[PDB]
Design a protein around this nucleic acid. Sequence first.
RNA 1: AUGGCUGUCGUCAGCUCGUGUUGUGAAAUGUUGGGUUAAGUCCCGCAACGAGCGCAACCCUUAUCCUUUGUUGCCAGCGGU
Length: 112
Amino acid sequence: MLKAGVHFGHQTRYWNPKMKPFIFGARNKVHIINLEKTVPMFNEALAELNKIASRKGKILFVGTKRAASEAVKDAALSCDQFFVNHRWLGGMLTNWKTVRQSIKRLKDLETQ
RNA sequence: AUGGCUGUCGUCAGCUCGUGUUGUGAAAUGUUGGGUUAAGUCCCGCAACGAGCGCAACCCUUAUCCUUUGUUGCCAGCGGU
Ligand SMILES: [Mg+2]
Ligand SMILES: [Mg+2]
Ligand SMILES: [Mg+2]
Ligand SMILES: [Mg+2]
Ligand SMILES: [Mg+2]
Ligand SMILES: [Mg+2]
Ligand SMILES: [Mg+2]
Ligand SMILES: [Mg+2]
């Protein structure tokens, strides 16, 4: 059921064809998602995230679009996980060996 | 055939590498873009993240002042010559 609040979908422009099964679609030439399809998927995702946390893992929230910036740092501060709040540095994971020095370099400033 | 040394483009601001990513590949990106600088100088942005040789600084000299020392250098204030 509609556990959600009020979003009823968005993104009138440039709709991706391969998302047709998730589209309900109607008003004011703006697509609206099929929340009936969403709820089982969101619950399934929520259940899985838990399993991971239960084996002790990090989730690394990612959301860099202004609006959500503060929303992310807070949600990630709580739950003691980690987050990326601003521009995602290309290669932040593929070459972790190089960004590691930047972290170590950063740690130096805080201590000094 | 060479070492060493030297001129020259040019004291011009450029030249590259590690990892990552893109391309079948030669390669590309970074190093491009908006401003700015004498400067690849700096800031912002950005599949790039960092680094090196260059630029700048550290060197010599010149322009002001202070402390120390005062002869073979100096003579403001004192004595007569
Ligand atoms: Mg390849
Ligand atoms: Mg170049
Ligand atoms: Mg290039
Ligand atoms: Mg530029
Ligand atoms: Mg430079
Ligand atoms: Mg750049
Ligand atoms: Mg120099
Ligand atoms: Mg006299």
